[PDB]
Write a protein that binds this ligand. Structure first.
Ligand SMILES: NC(=O)c1ccc(Cc2ccccc2)cc1
Ligand SMILES: [Ca+2]
Length: 123
């Protein structure tokens, strides 16, 4: 869920999860257009992951799951079901993705009217 998403991102990366709350075209609720940079690609890929999780019959924004932060790395588990494993995998992936990125301040609160109607495909 959102609590774990924030935690995992904070665990691995060098910056507050708030840094991604409305950034580029994809970091934040929803998202569309051409991803603006590496961080925006991470969020695009995460949005895709959550959509897949929803299609599998999970609730990616709400379901709690256990994880550990060890040496600024996310370890997923113990998982009680498949949704908890999918969710944790999604969040672990974006945490790892964002941790390797440099922040472009100019994309924080980027104007949504510049984000194109269509988006790159998932997978
Ligand atoms: N995929 C996304 O759009 C996306 C959006 C935000 C974050 C980081 C965050 C997590 C919880 C609360 C605020 C920020 C990660 C991914
Ligand atoms: Ca998004």
């Amino acid at each position: 869920g959102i609590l774990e998403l924030a935690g995992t991102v904070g665990c691995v990366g060098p910056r507050t999860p708030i840094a991604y709350m409305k950034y580029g075209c994809f970091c934040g609720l929803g998202g569309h257009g051409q991803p603006r940079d590496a961080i925006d690609w991470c969020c695009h890929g995460h949005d895709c992951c959550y959509t897949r999780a929803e299609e599998a019959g999970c609730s990616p924004k709400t379901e709690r799951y256990s994880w550990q932060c060890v040496n600024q790395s996310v370890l997923c588990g113990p998982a009680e079901n498949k949704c908890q494993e999918l969710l944790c995998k999604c969040d672990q992936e974006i945490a790892n993705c964002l941790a390797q990125t440099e922040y472009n301040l100019k994309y924080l609160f980027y104007p949504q009217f510049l984000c194109e109607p269509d988006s790159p495909k998932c997978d």
